[model samples]
Target chain A: KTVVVTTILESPYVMMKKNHEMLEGNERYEGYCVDLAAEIAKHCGFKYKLTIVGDGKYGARDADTKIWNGMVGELVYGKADIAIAPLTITLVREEVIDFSKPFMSLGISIMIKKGTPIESAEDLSKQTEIAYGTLDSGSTKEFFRRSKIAVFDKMWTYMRSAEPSVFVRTTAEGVARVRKSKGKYAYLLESTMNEYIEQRKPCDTMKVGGNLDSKGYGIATPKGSSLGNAVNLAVLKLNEQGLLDKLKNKWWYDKGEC
Target chain B: TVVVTTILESPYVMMKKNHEMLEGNERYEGYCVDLAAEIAKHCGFKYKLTIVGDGKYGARDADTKIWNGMVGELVYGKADIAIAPLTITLVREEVIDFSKPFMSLGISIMIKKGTPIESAEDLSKQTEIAYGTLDSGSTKEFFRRSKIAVFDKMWTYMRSAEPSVFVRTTAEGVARVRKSKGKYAYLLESTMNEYIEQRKPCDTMKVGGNLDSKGYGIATPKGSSLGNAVNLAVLKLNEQGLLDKLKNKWWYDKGEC
Candidate 1:
């Protein structure tokens, strides 16, 4: 069977090519995941079609009806055969879907414009002089909202009620807000994304402080899917062959934008 | 050649096994031995690694008001530099110049492998777990001077815990945690915690991130001719990823943990 691949078009991951019309099939896109999809399909011995998640958002379950949204819903509903992107591995998400061993490890990190007074999480958790937030609908925001830890809970209270609203809808909007906020706002996202941005052009934003929590991203499939074991072994094989490290360096460092 | 003073802190400095006969730098080896070699090669300096006679990291005695440890050696001209995990504090910086921080660390919790305490707040909220700090050091000073409510409350509880919570040394504190059967935890710098985690008695773990931001620095006499060279060398090593490699060599490469 030709597997259907679902992903999000995020930078350094899947991206539509500038010359997409001239290309066909998987050749139309480029990024870490584009290259990754090619490798996984080759190794797993399956033909696959690449498709972006229709919702254009990372997965979240609606608080009211408890309906899963975004990529998670796509997989659970059998709309897609596989999802391979920066999909975070969370305890809550694991029940409805199955995940392979993590493809990449990351942690929540702070993004500050140059000369911002904040240095560490405690610096923000203790003061209101600087405004800070996370992506509005993902693990980062959920962590603050649900945490019982004193420091994180305090930060959630500030972010959830701050006048003018600090949360951004996407990683780009978060980074852009950080660039344009003039030291007034700070963004918290995965450290891998933060480091990638730090090396990009205009390069004015820097990730400060150690990661607040340790987590990782994994390839996901609907629970009990037949493709689960093969895809997991493919990820493990790539990792064992050092191909994962090479791909990361290729996408993140080769261009030298900064 | 300059005389650099350091303390005989375990893992940081120790006499080489066959060193009863060998003299000068070859007589000693450990983490600082490797670091000193890198700095010497990078900065183009020749030096001697001499342990402080008093074996302190340089602190002022409150009663007599006299400096001791590596900082004292630098300020008094007894040593030209100090290459160790000597902490950077305002009092030491006012008397002697510190190169850019060579390593970042902060207060951390050392716990038995199966302990229920997970974070600083976890320790603060539970009465079942008794915790303490080194009686006289940066970790103790951090709590004593902190303004945050959780840390302030912790400091108050530790200070008057009735059974004398504070210990005389880090080694003593670590031992207390190990033998307390999950009832006690010790707070110390992350660097030391990291070192201990790799050593024998693998039953302990450094849980949670650090409590504050601080770093170890190379100290030199005020306006030292080698100050800038030492600072730049640290930055160079950090940039080249040599520091991380060296840490691996010292802490994990030996395969004890």
Candidate 2:
């Protein structure tokens, strides 16, 4: 059987190889998810093609048509057998497509300049001294967007209509703004990604405070795909055997700079 | 007129070296006194600076349900505001509110000189070494509330270890780390950590970045109208970069970094 794995080309998850043209099939890409997809396919006795989702998104539903976009859409519409990236498991996405057991857990966290004086989201919400933001379209932003929690809701209200627009289009841009704002800006994103950047060079940023909430990423499949169960079992087995932990260490720490 | 409650903490507030002749508010002076003066001047108020009588930073007693320290003074209407190094924390925020931080800091690691630990990972990974926090502080509370995978596992390990890895006070903790040689590490706020690192018999150094971030804020009673003016004062000083200037004057202008 051939498994077409749909995923977004996100760092440490799904990424093209340096010399991808000379490689073939799974060899064309590598990442935390890439390696896992290969291992799962082997465990389930199937061949796989690493298909980068055409729209390059983690997935969201259109408000009017109720149509899904990004990797989830590819899985929902039968364009791929499963998705293997940091696609968040939200109740909205679960209704449109089936998600296997969570393979990884993370939460929205605060990222600050090395010497920034601001601390908690509560600190930021109470005043206008330090400006902070989240990625405009990702689950991190949506979490705040739909929040009922007082501080988070207040933050969303501010970010949605601040005069200069605190919401950034991407994490890279938000981080750059933090570095350039001279202790006046902060970026909120998944802790996993924040940890990745903290260990990178020019190590002048830090993850501060605890996460706002807890959530995870899951493997997505069409509602009835048999691959879902097998992949779920594979994930459980890998988690049990400590393979996931080892791989994380290999990718994150084995190459760490600071 | 605003009645400001202050605490006597190092560098932030202190009885001046030559204060034996002064009385009342004139008897006290330090960074916080200067700060209270600046805030009162800018926000248009006169203040009487009184030291907290209970000698606490304000933790609500579970048994008595009574708040203590400067926080208690504010909550019970004995004072209008507090200008101190009091940490802004969630529990305290329930009964009181804080202006934006006058200073930001985080909990960090303090290891004896040449302890062979470069980062928190190194300390969290081994059993041959022991580490603990200054008990009952916000840093300990942060670990208690968290279930983040990394710190969660470390907490489990620390709790499971015998001989009880919690200490009574920061002074006692630092003394123990030095006495234990390479066997112990103390966790505390980076501000204090940096301060201790600069003092004499400097056999300890801070290792790794902070485990988390928070701030020291000017506290006022919850729902008090002074809270609004106090917050604005802090923000204006921050925007003018005077908070940084004040910090440098107090923490390192003495050339102790």
Candidate 3:
């Protein structure tokens, strides 16, 4: 039986190949996660099919309906056997799913148009001239909402009530807004994405200041799946073999254009 | 049924002065000592602390595949748990289970004060100063396995550096940097570097941002029953700010910096 892997469409993680329409099955996609999935399957001795999440979002639960959405929902509903994506391992997610030891570490960081005056989260918090926000319904926004720390709490208070509703629908949208805003908008995203964008063409964005907090990206599975054990071991083995680092460099820096 | 394995490292686990006058756990006093107490108390378990005989963090034999050090203690059933400054890493996690991070740190560069180096890039670019990490640990493994251009370049120099730059312990690395007259730099965890920066002499500083970010976890033999309850306790302690409080108590309450 083939493992059904649910992943998100994010650059350098999973993206459509240049000749995607002409390709079939797994051949349609290529990126960091694509390479990782192949290695994991080989090590675990499993065949797999890679399917992008239908909702185009990384998973979150609805406050009223109590329904899960995005890649997380697929696994919970038995639509997929695993999820290999840039999913952040948070406490809430851990309660419903099992995560492999983090394959990559990342943290929330501020991305701005080159030459933006802001240098740190504190700088953004104290100023009103430049607007800053995070992608909607993601870990970065959740971090701010749940943070008890004074600066983050204050920043959350502003964003939750700010005019024009600062949240963006996707990472690309957020990066585009930062590039087009002419230093007026800063996007707070995971450092992995920020650093990747910094090297892409039109490279006018910069990641400044230290990460506000640290976390990791974990491969996810439905809670209590038997596959969890083998997959976890696979991730660790791949990491020790230097394949994780190699895959990251292959997708991020090796392809860097600017 | 609970025997906690630990290492005797500065500010994490250490021999208290007049240790010869004390017995059992009282012989030690430091971050991990206090942390073990908190963890045991929160998880409602009684445990005796035992230092690993080998005095190693942990590593696997390339040929025999036998694990060694605190990790091996847990793996081989010599200890029921490990509550020390041991990092949560993929290789170790395969053989043992780890709680959510109780402490966060990263591999960092340590340089004597007034050294011209400010970042890893600075160290990589020049040869006037020699640098290395503790042999057979995560820091060395990171540089050894890193494929990044700068880190790979640094690793090449370190592995082949004349007179052998690798140290046997974190203290040895720090002392080398301290006495080398600015000729050597030590690569170690940010936790130890920060702790040492606040100590007497204060001749060293943790330079640049950490090369990478990760955390230290309480480890258990894979599938150990204690893993579940202990993991929850760590989360609760972090929520209550007890972890932060402990960090301040051990790292800065007696600051000389």
Candidate 4:
């Protein structure tokens, strides 16, 4: 049986190569996460195909105009058997689908141009000195909107009313806004991505303060999928054998741009 | 200001029940550990004698020699600060002369009699019938001492050898014997022991296998003494709600017993 896997292209995870047109599906797909998917498939004894989401959005529920995006929609529609991407596990998503033990751990963090006056989340929450926004259709935005934490609750009030243009559509747009807007704009994204960007050329951005909360990037499947048990076990085995740490180092440390 | 600290009774720790009868300089005393002495004398603290070691024995050494017994010894400076019993934390004990944490939790388990299981060692080799010890003490000794699998390599040599006795003392030994009764043996002492004995006094008793490992009680100096800074820190952890969280996490929430 074919196990249809949904994924996304988030640099070093499923990046497009310069010579993508000349390569086969399996060859073009070569990264830590890609190899992990192949290993999991082999262990589970399933034939699989990787289908990248048409859009890079990680999924969200718009507060003003409710709509879902990316892999969340894929699972909701029964278009995919499993989603092995950097899919953050959240309360909203947990209500819709089931997630295995986290394949990777990360949290929401803010990236700002170096030399910015903002030093902590407390600073970001208090004033209009630095205008910040999160990815429009992602877990980060949802977290602020749903958080009960004092600072985040206040920040959410500011974001919901910020001009439409100020709210970016993607992580890339948020980062671009910070880079182009000098120190006046800050991008709030996953700590994993922010760390990745901090090490790259023109590494003018800095991630400040501790993360807001602890979370994991999970392997998600539609609720009650028969393969869920085996997949969860596979993830556990991988963690036990230290393969997860090895893969993380291979992608994020050994070959990172920064 | 003397800080009054309350502690429980166990194998590793002991207190002089008749301290009032002793000479002025030699009032109440037992196997006082370095850390406990520091906390008592310097941390501006005083302690009222009470029995708090929920289990029977003190703590076991998984490596060389079963140096078990006496929770009071740890608190009195007869031993180093303990991670077992009197359940104190590393952050608080550092102000005194505390050592590293010995184990993470408490002891618990239950078993039916005449089930063909005699000891933790016997249970380790079987596949169809599996067994586990309580999270932290002498009961863990049985599996830890066995020459098999995870237990074999990780704990076997550490527990059975001297200087760090696998069994540690008498309480653990008694508890193990009572619980197994040839079938499956549950490892626990004191609170669980008294509770189980009163609830159901069957062919099963408290057994002979008393454990050496208990919760985190570290050795410290007297209150207002040199170790007061560290002693107060330990008190603060309990005050700040961390100690409660750890107790619940290990006692109530920990799975597989």
Candidate 5:
């Protein structure tokens, strides 16, 4: 079966080759997730076509319309058989989709302009001089909202009443806000994406403190898809062979977006 | 301030109530070696009779014939600071002396009585009766020493000879012979001894296998009287809750072993 593997154009995962117009899918394709997807296909004895998600958002449920977007929508609406993106596994997301054993483990972190007094997640909860917010309806925002811990409970209280403009529409905008708002604004997001951005040139931001909590990145498939078992096993095998490390290095380090 | 200490009765370390009974300097109390004379009077402290070597035998060395038995000797020789009931540490012993760890970790197997197996020496070459070691060491021994693998060169030669008596000593031989009449024998030593003693009694006996190597109690006095520093340090630290913390960190919750 030709599995429709949906991915993102984020660097080290998938980016149009400078010469992508001249090559085929097998040749032009490259990135950690892209290579891992190919290896999974090889092991599963299935063929696939890799396509980038139409929008950059990492899937969210619309409040008013109750619809989803990005990779989540792709899987829910049957636009793709599986999603091999850096999508986080969250309780709310789990209600609508089945995710495999975490292909990658990560936590939420804060990105701030350098030299901020913050050095821990606990610091974020204690003060208000450094205004903090998360991408709207994303995992980071939800983490604070659903947390049973004291610090996160307080953080949620602060974010809930903050001005709407402070609630970022995307990770990119949140980061931009942190960078432009001087040290006064802190952007809350996934450690993986935060690290990726930290490495870019004009890197005026730093990850302060440790992660708030632990979670994992998973390959989201439509609920009850028969492909779940095969996909989970493929991920496990890739991990055992150290191919996951190779792929991570390829995407996060070897060739990354500046 | 210096404290003179002795040990309780065991070949490794013992207290001489008789020494207290005897006249000064005539008491006989030495195990790893006669360390009393070397340690009788140091620069700053007056010597008094007390229980010293708190742990066991690894504190001594047969070759140098120095600091051989007493835990105090290890401290005097600067070999180790403290000792426990000495047993072997399969992995960590290279870096430190153990008052012999209280348990052994090696390979052993159980089979129904009257099976063809007689000894570890015999088992080295056969494939029909498949065998394996506990996760780490002895099992590696079986595959590494087997003649077939040498031909395959997967590892170095299996050390056990036919009759597979690879059992390291007489203690293991006696125990293995006692249990199972030869059906199930465990391949380990003193560490296993104390550990099994502490457990609920079972029909099983630690049988025929002896260790190819020996484990010893730790002492550290060879370089200087630093052994006293380390020994007292261990005791004080242990009293202050550091030893329990280290045990919890390294062994109590460990699943890797």
Candidate 6:
């Protein structure tokens, strides 16, 4: 059976090639995840078809429905055989899917327009002039929602009931809000994405402060997928050989715009 | 019956007071002792704890072609699992399976209070302060293999530093830092550094960001039947905050700092 790999169309991780319209099937997309998919397939000796996750969201459980969405949903509903993206290896997600040891480490971070006077989460929490929020339907948002620390708990309280709402539907929208809001809006996202954007064109934003927490991105399979061990081992080998670091540099820095 | 292999590193594993009177697993207690019980409970297994015959964190011998320490116990089928502060490194991952990390840590710099150093770069640039890591351990290996410029430079200095900076054990490294009057800094895992920081005299502190990031994982022989359940159980514990709670119980609850 051909492995149905579910992924997201996020910048630097997966994106339409410049000639995407002229390409076919797997060739239509390129980026970190696209390249990783090839390496994983070759290492595991399997044929696979790359499919973009339909909802364009990382997996999250809808509070009311008790149903999962995004690539996680694909696996839970048997829509895909595996998910290879910048998906986080979180406790909630791990309950429903198997994850390899992290292929990459990252943490929630603050993205601010340059000269925004925000250097840390504490700075953001101390003032009300700057509006801050996270991408909707992602671990970054869930982190604040579940955080017990005083500053984070307070920040979450304000964000959950802020006027005009602070959440954005996607990472791009969050970045866009930061860029267009001048010095008034800050976006919270994974450091990998924030760092990637810092090196991109129109580099008007910078990741401020150290990461708020530590976590990693893992290759996910269904709860008991037969391919889990093979893929997991393959990931560890790739990491050991420095292939994962090379891939990150290839996609995030080699194609640097700044 | 499952036989669990572990090491006798402090806080992670140590003989309880008057352990000679005890038998079996009752003789030992520490972070991993509690962790092993939790893992077995969640995985539904009965296990006997045994210390590794060779006291090591697992390494591959260049000439002997043998794995030693807790990892060897599982690889050679001497034990069913290794529940210790074993690191998740590439070399070890090939021969044995590792569960997702139960605790995240990194190679860090430990300095006696009043040390001028604030970061790795500061130590690398100046010759006044000497630094090194545990011999034959991950931190030393890291410097030896690192392609990063500052770390490479530090490696060169330490490998050839007069009188040899490498230590036989982590305690030796910490002792060097504490007794050196800020002239020496110990490069060790952050977990140990943090623990020592909370000890009496309380003069040593972990400074700056970590040099690199990694974690400790439970180890089993590759393709072991227990691998899957143990892996899931770790994730479950992490989500329940049991891992965090355990870390506090061992690292901070007894703090004198």
- Could you tell which candidate, 2 or 6, scores higher by TM-score? 6
Off by over 4 Å in 6: A63-67, A115-130, A145-154, A253-258, B1-4, B10-51, B60-66, B76-81, B106-168, B173-213, B221-229, B240-257
> What are the per-residue Cα lDDT tens digits for candidate 6 across A1-258?
899999998989999999999889999999999999999999999999999999998989988999999999999999999999999888788888988888888888999999999999999999999999998898888889888778889899999999888999889999999999989999999999999999998989999999887678999999889898789888877765557868987988898889
* Docking category of candidate 2: incorrect
Cα lDDT of model 2 by residue, A1-68, tens digit: 67888987766776788999999988899889998888888888988888888876778778899887
lDDT for B166 (candidate 3): 96
| TM-score of chain A taken by itself, candidate 3 | 0.99
Which lDDT tens digits does candidate 4 get at residues B1-257?
22223333332234447766765324433323223454455444444433334333335345953333334444445433332344332222323333222223334334555555544454445644323344444345445443335446434443443433233333453355455444434455444443334432444444333232223434444332333245344444432334444434433443222
lDDT of 2 at B80: 91
**Residue range B1-257, candidate 3, lDDT tens digits:** 48999998989899998999899999999989998899888878888899999989998989999998999999999999998989877789878999877877888999999889999999999999999999778898889888778899999999999999999889999999999999999999999999999987989999998887667889999999999888777766755456777888998896887
Per-residue C-alpha lDDT of model 5 across residues B1-257, encoded as one tens digit per residue: 33433344333233456767775334544332233223332223434434443332333343774333344354454332433334332222333333211112333433334456555555544545433322123234334433442222322222332445334332344355445454434443333332333333333333344323222333333444544333333323322333333433333333121
TM-score, candidate 4, is 0.54
Please report, as a residue range, the 10-residue window in candidate 5 chain B with the lowest summed lDDT.
B98-107
Show where candidate 1 strays beyond 4 Å. Answer: B1-257
Give DockQ for candidates 1 onward, in order: 0.01, 0.02, 0.27, 0.03, 0.02, 0.35
A99-191 in candidate 5: lDDT tens per residue?
Answer: 765666567888988888888878888898889888886677766766666677888888899775568766678888888886899888888
The lDDT per prediction is 0.82, 0.78, 0.89, 0.59, 0.56, 0.88
* Per-residue lDDT of B251 in model 4: 35
Ranked candidates, highest TM-score first = 3, 6, 4, 1, 2, 5
Model 2 C-alpha lDDT per residue in residues B226-251, reported as the tens digit of each score: 87677667756754446656776877
Over the stretch A38-86, how does candidate 3's per-residue lDDT look in tens digits?
9999989999999999988898999999999988899888999999999
In lDDT terms, how accurate is model 3?
A: 0.89
- Say what the RMSD of model 5 is: 21.9
Give me the displacement of residue B121 in model 4, in angstroms: 32
Highest DockQ scorer: 6
Candidate 1 overall lDDT versus native: 0.82
TM-scores computed on chain B for all candidates: 0.90, 0.84, 0.98, 0.31, 0.30, 0.94
Q: How accurate is candidate 2 locally (lDDT)?
A: 0.78
